[PDB]
Amino acid sequence: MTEYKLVVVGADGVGKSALTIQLIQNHFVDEYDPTIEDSYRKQVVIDGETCLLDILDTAGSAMRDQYMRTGEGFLCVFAINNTKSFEDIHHYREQIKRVKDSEDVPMVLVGNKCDLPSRTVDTKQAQDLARSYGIPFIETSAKTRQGVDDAFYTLVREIRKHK
Amino acid sequence: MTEYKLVVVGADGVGKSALTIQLIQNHFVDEYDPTIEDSYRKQVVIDGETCLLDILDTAMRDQYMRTGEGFLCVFAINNTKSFEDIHHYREQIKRVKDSEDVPMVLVGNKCDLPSRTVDTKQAQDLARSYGIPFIETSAKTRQGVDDAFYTLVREIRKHK
Amino acid sequence: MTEYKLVVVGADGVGKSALTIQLIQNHFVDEYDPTIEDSYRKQVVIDGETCLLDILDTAGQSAMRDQYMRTGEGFLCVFAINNTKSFEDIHHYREQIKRVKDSEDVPMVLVGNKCDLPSRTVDTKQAQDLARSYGIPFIETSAKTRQGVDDAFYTLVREIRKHK
Ligand SMILES: O=C1N[C@H](c2c(CNCCCCCCNCc3[nH]c4ccccc4c3[C@H]3NC(=O)c4ccc(O)cc43)[nH]c3ccccc23)c2cc(O)ccc21
Ligand SMILES: O=C1N[C@H](c2c(CNCCCCCCNCc3[nH]c4ccccc4c3[C@H]3NC(=O)c4ccc(O)cc43)[nH]c3ccccc23)c2cc(O)ccc21
Ligand SMILES: Nc1nc2c(ncn2[C@@H]2O[C@H](COP(=O)(O)OP(=O)(O)O)[C@@H](O)[C@H]2O)c(=O)[nH]1
Ligand SMILES: Nc1nc2c(ncn2[C@@H]2O[C@H](COP(=O)(O)OP(=O)(O)O)[C@@H](O)[C@H]2O)c(=O)[nH]1
Ligand SMILES: Nc1nc2c(ncn2[C@@H]2O[C@H](COP(=O)(O)OP(=O)(O)O)[C@@H](O)[C@H]2O)c(=O)[nH]1
Ligand SMILES: [Mg+2]
Numbered sequence A: 001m002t003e004y005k006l007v008v009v010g011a012d013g014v015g016k017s018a019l020t021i022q023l024i025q026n027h028f029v030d031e032y033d034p035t036i037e038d039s040y041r042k043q044v045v046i047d048g049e050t051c052l053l054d055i056l057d058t059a060g061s062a063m064r065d066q067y068m069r070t071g072e073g074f075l076c077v078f079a080i081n082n083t084k085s086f087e088d089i090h091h092y093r094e095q096i097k098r099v100k101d102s103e104d105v106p107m108v109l110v111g112n113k114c115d116l117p118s119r120t121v122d123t124k125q126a127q128d129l130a131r132s133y134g135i136p137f138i139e140t141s142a143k144t145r146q147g148v149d150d151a152f153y154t155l156v157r158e159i160r161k162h163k
Numbered sequence B: 001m002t003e004y005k006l007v008v009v010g011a012d013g014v015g016k017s018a019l020t021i022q023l024i025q026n027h028f029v030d031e032y033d034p035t036i037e038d039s040y041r042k043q044v045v046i047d048g049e050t051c052l053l054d055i056l057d058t059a060m061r062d063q064y065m066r067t068g069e070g071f072l073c074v075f076a077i078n079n080t081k082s083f084e085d086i087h088h089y090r091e092q093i094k095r096v097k098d099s100e101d102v103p104m105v106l107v108g109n110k111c112d113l114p115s116r117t118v119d120t121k122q123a124q125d126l127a128r129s130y131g132i133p134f135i136e137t138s139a140k141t142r143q144g145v146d147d148a149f150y151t152l153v154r155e156i157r158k159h160k
Numbered sequence C: 001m002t003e004y005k006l007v008v009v010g011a012d013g014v015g016k017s018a019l020t021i022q023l024i025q026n027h028f029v030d031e032y033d034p035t036i037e038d039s040y041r042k043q044v045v046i047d048g049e050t051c052l053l054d055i056l057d058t059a060g061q062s063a064m065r066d067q068y069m070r071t072g073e074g075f076l077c078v079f080a081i082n083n084t085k086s087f088e089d090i091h092h093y094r095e096q097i098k099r100v101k102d103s104e105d106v107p108m109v110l111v112g113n114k115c116d117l118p119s120r121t122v123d124t125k126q127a128q129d130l131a132r133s134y135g136i137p138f139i140e141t142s143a144k145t146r147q148g149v150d151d152a153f154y155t156l157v158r159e160i161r162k163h164k
C-alpha cells in the first residue's frame, strides 16, 4: 500500500491539532497541549485507491528542516479570524520551497475555524493568495468537521499529480 | 582533502579583495587594484575537518556562478547602494545555478567605521528572508573575517 | 527521528521472516507462515544516532514488487548457506533492484543465513567474492542463535547513511 507523508504547518492556535485528530479519529478535541508534536496514521480510500496517510502535526530549526525534507505535501493552515496567521503563510511557503529546493512542492492552503462569525480574513483574499501559488484553497472547521476530509484528500491528489 | 570553491561578490569598493586577502594571508591591503580578478587557495581546519578553500575574488560571471559552491554576498555598512545591490546578486545566483537553496552568507563589511548608513536590523531581516546567515566584518581589523568564510563552508557542508 | 525503509529479499525458506522477527522482537520463530508479507518498526541506536527502522519482510519472490523496491532505501539480500540455488538467485535480486531504482549504487548488504547448520554448500570465500564484486558488505547470520542479526541490519543502515 502506497503511503504519503503529510505535514500540517501554521501559526500557534490555528487548529493544526484539531484538524489532524478530526481526520484521524473523527474526534473533536477542544484542548490539546500546544507543545505536543506527534505523527498519526490512517488508511483511507481516495479516488478508488487505498493509501496510508502518515500525518505530522507540528508544534513549535534543524529538526524543522528535517521534517520538511521528508514530508511530501504540506497543509498550510491559518485561522479565518486571525489575520496574522494568514500573513504568516508566505513564510511557511518560502521555507518549504527553499528546504525542498522546489518551486512545485505539493501544498494546500487551509482556512480553518469557518464555523466562527468573527471573520477577519476575506475568502477572496485567501483565494487570491492560493491562486498566486497555484495551489488549492479549502475552508475548514475542525469543530464541525466541514472540509476536513477535503483538505487532506486534496493534498493527496496534489502529491499524486506531482508524481 | 575536500576542496570548496567560494565566490566573493558585491559592489565595487565594499571590500571583496581586502576580505579575501585577510582570510588567505592574514594581511590587510589598503588599496588593491579594483580590476584584478584572481583566485587563491588556503588549507584550513573547520569543525575538526581539514579542507582546501579555493576563493574567487570577483572584479563570464555565469561560468563562475555555476562552478562556485558557495557565495559571500558583501556590502559595506556605510554604502546603502551596495546593500540595495545584494538582492540582484541573490537573484542572479539563484537563476544561474537553478536552485532556491544556494549556500550563501550575507556580509556587512567595514564595521570599524563610524559612518554607518545600513542598520544591523535591516541586514538581519534581509538574511532572515533568504534563510542565510548574516555576519558583520572588518577586513581592516580582521574582526569576523574567518567567521564569514567558515560559516559559508558550514552552509555548503549542510547542503551536501 | 530519522526513519529508514529496509527491504528483506531472498528465496523462499532462506530465513527472511526469522531474521526480521529476531531483529524486531529478539525472538526466534521456527515456523512462520511463508505467505505473510508484513512490515515492522523498531527504534534503535546506531553509532550514537537514534533512528526508526521500518522493515518490510517480503513473501512472494510484479507491480507491487516494483513499488516496494522504489520505496525501499536499502535491501538485505538473503541466501541460506546450505542452499546453493538461493545464492545463485542473488544476482537476479541485485539486477532487479538496480533496474527498478535506476541506480548502480543502491544500499545493499549480502546476508548468508543459517550459519549454525552443518550442511554448508556455499563457501564463505565464495560469498565474500560476490559481495566484493558488488562493492557491498557480506554478513553471515543465524536467525536461530541471533548471531550477526543486528550486524546485518545496522550495517545496512550505515550503507544508507554513507550513500546520503
Ligand atoms: O509506500 C509504501 N510503503 C510501504 C512500506 C512500509 C510501511 N510503512 C508504514 C508506515 C510507518 C510510519 C513510521 C512513522 N513515521 C513518522 C513520520 N511521519 C511523518 C509525516 C510527515 C513528515 C515526517 C514524518 C515522520 C518522520 N520520519 C522522519 O524521517 C522524520 C524526521 C523528522 C521528524 O520530525 C519526523 C519524521 N514499510 C516499508 C519498508 C520497506 C519498503 C516499503 C515499506 C509499502 C509496502 C509496499 O509493499 C508497497 C508500497 C509501500
Ligand atoms: O576534493 C578533492 N579535491 C582533490 C583533487 C585535486 C586538488 N585540487 C586542488 C587545486 C585547485 C585548483 C585551482 C584552480 N581553481 C580556480 C578557481 N577557483 C574558483 C573559485 C570559485 C569559482 C571558480 C573558481 C575557479 C575557476 N574554475 C572554473 O571552472 C572557472 C571559471 C571561471 C572563473 O572566473 C574561474 C574559474 N585535484 C584532483 C584531481 C582529480 C580528483 C581530485 C582532485 C582531492 C583529492 C583526493 O585524493 C580526495 C579528494 C579531493
Ligand atoms: N470554533 C473553532 N475552534 C477551533 C477550530 N479548530 C481549532 N479550534 C480551537 O482553537 C484552539 C487551538 O486549536 P489547536 O488544535 O490546539 O491549534 P494548534 O495550536 O494549531 O495545534 C483550540 O481551543 C481549539 O479547540 C475550529 O474549526 N473552530
Ligand atoms: N575601514 C575599512 N576600510 C576597508 C575595509 N575593507 C576594505 N576597506 C577599504 O575600502 C576600499 C576598497 O576595498 P577593496 O578590497 O579594494 O574593495 P573591492 O572593490 O570590493 O575589492 C579600500 O581602500 C580598502 O582598504 C574595512 O573593513 N574597513
Ligand atoms: N537452523 C536455522 N534455521 C533457520 C534459520 N533461519 C530460518 N530458519 C528456519 O528455516 C525455515 C524458513 O524460515 P523463514 O523465516 O520462514 O524463511 P522465509 O521464507 O525466507 O521467510 C523456518 O523453519 C525457520 O525456522 C537459521 O539461521 N538457522
Ligand atoms: Mg497543536
Ligand SMILES: [Mg+2]
Pocket (backbone or CB within 6 Å): B016, B017, B018, B032, B033, B034, B035, B036, B057, B058, B059
Ligand atoms: Mg577587488
Ligand SMILES: [Mg+2]
Pocket (backbone or CB within 6 Å): C016, C017, C018, C032, C033, C034, C035, C036, C058, C059
Ligand atoms: Mg516469510
